[PDB]
Ligand binder design. Structure first.
Ligand code: SF4
Lengths: 98, 232, 99, 54
């Protein structure tokens, strides 16, 4: 449970807001957009771009969540350091990619 | 027990009764037609039959396969109407605007009909003795140049009769426009292709999110923008 | 790698009859696993008769034939509700006084 | 040093069009029908080692 039988917080960081079915309800506070998340947790190599084709009817802003599986680099023996990788987000926009 | 009166019970059991009469009302006020009153027969004076001070025009009409079940219907009773003089062709010419219209049959014994229907009057005239049954036209089965046959179902027992009623869509509000959940009561804004128009009679809501926004009533869009588009 | 992406439609919509919840759970004050929510809800405040106290499941006197709001478990009143709720029931067709 | 990652893994999926909105009659315990799901990654880490151009 979020709360114990005695009012102890069994889990920290969740903020459940509840709405009944009343005809005049206010948007749930802390929620400001609809949004819709798709996980495709795939990797990106040199000469294999991806492409996704977002074709919703109603989307207005689009968020990407890319990452680094790891950023470890060693020179000769030990001396691990930042590695500096690079990534592109393109959109077809008429002819080809901008 | 049917909700019939003591008079109707006595006449039902009677050794020799007056001829039972069926009076149809095909109501289309709910679908963009208008109410018609029909009756298979005409009174002894060769005039349309008057019941509760209302006229039912003579017209060849007949329903068959009516029954009451504990279980379902498992029959779907058929109402067949004369289509000479193209009454029915002209009625709809699409049989889409005929579907969902209601049909009320009334069974009443001749002994309780109004004094106007008889040459010598009637001492037993009573506008209260009848057995009513509502049906909804559900699909026009067939339509010749003689007659058109429809399929009737109990109001609570049709294809559109389904429980939990509301279907959760993306990009399509189900609320009826300017109804009560839609709630919008402003001045007219656009038509259903989202072409801006300041006309009262030409505005309707598209039920897309865009349509909504024209009346800036995204507040209450009965849809669920963002759920999955594919049915699966 | 490309974990995911969000289509975001930025309207502030109430879902004005549904009874939703939504949690908005933070990550680092939790576990990597799935967040599988489950609410022990109570029901739907449906139109029981006047004279009926739901918490004691009691009847005052001669009903008088009126209706009031409250939550209850009475299956009779659940049935009534489902037949004659305008929005999601058979309220559209049928109607009260036909039940 | 520091925490590891904790990255919300798999999400239960969105509800699909035409699924009907349930009616709950009294008591019972329900599951989750997702209508809106959005994961919003912030930046707990220090400094500029994520640079965005455009
Ligand atoms: S789209 Fe929005 S404003 Fe139009 S009818 Fe639906 S709820 Fe009302």
């Amino acid at each position: 449970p979020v709360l114990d039988t005695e009012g102890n917080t069994n889990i920290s960081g969740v903020t459940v807001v509840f709405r009944a079915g009343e005809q005049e309800q206010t948007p749930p506070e802390g929620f400001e957009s609809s949004g819709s998340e798709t996980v495709l947790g795939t990797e990106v190599k040199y000469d294999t771009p991806i492409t996704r084709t977002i074709t919703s009817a109603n989307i207005d802003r689009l968020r990407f969540t890319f990452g680094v599986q790891a950023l470890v680099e060693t020179t000769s023996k030990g001396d691990r350091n930042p590695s500096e990788v690079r990534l592109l987000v393109q959109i077809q926009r008429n002819g080809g990619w901008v | 027990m049917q909700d019939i009166r003591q008079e109707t019970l006595n006449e039902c059991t009677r050794a020799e009764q007056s001829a039972s009469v069926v009076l149809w009302e095909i109501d289309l006020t709910e679908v963009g037609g208008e109410r018609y009153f029909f009756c298979n027969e005409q009174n002894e004076k060769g005039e349309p039959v008057t019941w509760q001070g209302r006229q039912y025009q003579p017209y060849p009409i007949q329903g068959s396969g009516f029954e009451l079940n504990g279980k379902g219907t498992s029959t779907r009773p058929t109402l067949t109407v004369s289509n000479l003089y193209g009454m029915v062709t002209g009625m709809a010419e699409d049989m889409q605007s005929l579907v969902g219209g209601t049909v009320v049959r009334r069974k009443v014994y001749a002994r309780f009909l109004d004094a106007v229907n008889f040459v010598n009057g009637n001492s037993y005239a009573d506008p209260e003795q009848e057995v009513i049954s509502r049906w909804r036209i559900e699909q026009c089965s067939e339509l010749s140049a003689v007659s058109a046959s429809f399929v009737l179902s109990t109001p609570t027992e049709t294809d559109g009769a389904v429980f939990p009623g509301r279907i959760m869509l993306a990009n399509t509000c189900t609320w009826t426009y300017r109804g009560d959940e839609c709630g919008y009561s402003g001045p007219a804004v656009a038509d259903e292709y989202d072409q801006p128009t300041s006309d009262i009679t030409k505005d309707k809501c598209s039920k897309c999110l865009s349509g909504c926004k024209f009346r800036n009533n995204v507040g209450n869009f009965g849809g669920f923008l963002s759920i999955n588009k594919l049915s699966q | 790698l490309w974990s995911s992406y969000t289509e975001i439609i930025d309207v502030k919509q109430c879902y004005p009859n549904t009874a939703l919840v939504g949690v908005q759970v933070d990550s680092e004050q939790f576990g990597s696993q799935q967040v599988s929510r489950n609410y022990h809800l109570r029901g739907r405040i449906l139109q029981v008769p006047s004279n009926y106290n739901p918490q004691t499941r009691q009847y005052s006197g001669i009903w008088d034939g009126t209706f009031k709001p409250a939550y209850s478990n009475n299956m009779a009143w659940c049935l009534w509700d489902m037949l004659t709720h305008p929005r999601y029931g058979m309220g559209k067709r049928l109607g009260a006084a036909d039940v | 040093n520091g925490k590891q990652n904790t990255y919300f893994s798999s999400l239960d999926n969105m509800v699909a069009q035409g699924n009907v909105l349930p009616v709950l009659y009294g008591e019972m315990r329900v599951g989750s029908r997702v209508v809106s799901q959005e994961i919003s990654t912030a930046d707990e880490g220090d400094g500029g080692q994520v640079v965005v151009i455009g």
